[PDB]
């Protein structure tokens, strides 16, 4: 990469991006964007690193994906990131999966500085009807 294809360097601060974590019950997504969300620097998923469907949201796959992503973004010239941790939401579980914490620790142990952290789960002030019926999943 030519120097103009990387962020400029200045002593006042460092290169700051924001990472979006999707800690779902069936998959994990690790996504890096600019300060706005209109550009994308690196995107990895847990299903690229396992052969078993039931292991896609596992922590191990999340860590492997995170290491690959930090490699890419470091090559692209990013050093610090903000965090946006998110669950499925939308009249759903509203509880994080097991890959989120693994992703966070993988970022921390990859020599990446941390800024701010916040919940981004989409929650409503009103509810459309969810699936299952009034007797629920009976099994």
């Amino acid at each position: 990469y030519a120097p103009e294809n990387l962020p400029a360097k200045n002593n006042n601060s460092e290169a700051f991006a924001v990472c979006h974590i999707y800690a779902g019950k069936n998959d994990t997504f690790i996504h890096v964007t600019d300060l706005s969300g209109r550009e994308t620097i690196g995107r990895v998923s847990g299903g690229m690193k396992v052969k078993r469907h039931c292991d896609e949201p596992s922590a191990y796959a999340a860590m492997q994906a995170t290491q690959d992503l930090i490699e890419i973004i470091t090559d692209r010239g990013i050093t610090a990131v903000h965090i946006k941790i998110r669950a499925d939401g939308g009249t759903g579980k509203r509880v994080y999966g097991q890959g989120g914490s693994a992703a966070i620790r993988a970022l921390v142990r990859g020599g990446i500085k941390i800024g701010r952290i916040e919940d981004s789960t989409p929650i409503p002030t009103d509810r459309t009807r969810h699936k299952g019926g009034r007797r629920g999943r009976r099994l």
């Binding site: 990469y1 030519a2 294809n5 962020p7 600019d34 300060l35 706005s36 701010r116 916040e118 919940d119």
Partner: protein, 224 residues
Amino acid sequence: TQRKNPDPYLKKEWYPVIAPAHFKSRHIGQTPVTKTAGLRVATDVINHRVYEVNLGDLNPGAEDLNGNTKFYLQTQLVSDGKCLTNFHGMDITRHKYGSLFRKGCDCIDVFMDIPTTDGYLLRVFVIAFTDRFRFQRRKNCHVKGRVIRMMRAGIYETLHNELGKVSIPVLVTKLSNFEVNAKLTEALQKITMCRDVMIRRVKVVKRPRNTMELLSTMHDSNQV
């Protein structure tokens, strides 16, 4: 059916992003963009972008007072290889909102439409909670209806009087400070107990098509 493509980051270049003069740290950061080709022009594509910035990073210090407020800015004009922004809206964080709530208390939420002298029309949202008297025998802290209506009326009056009509820069300064919250509380505290009183967020509904004099006004230190 898969194919490989060349790396798109070999034809990129970054721009800096700048904040208004109401704040100390005016370097938001940098944004990438693709070099102009055909009709695509970077100075046009990056024209309207929205950046969410925490108030504690715009004003270093006062972390315990500024860490739970975050407004976002929008670029209006690209010049000198750098992007200029103005106010677009304000909000608090989710954890603070969740922390505000407690069982046994009452919650009041109010919104009013507030126009400006510059042609912006804004909708604001105000939240309040009741508290416990110092020597209250009972555990619950609910109140009667007349008190509730007095509190709503006082909120409307205070909001009208302090924000009835004001320019964007003055409003931004007031929001950066917390004087509107202070007025809301001391007016309400005169009626009853007030656990918390603040502004949840500010939305912009309509603005004029051209804001050039306003942008030139917001982005210089001395005029304000």
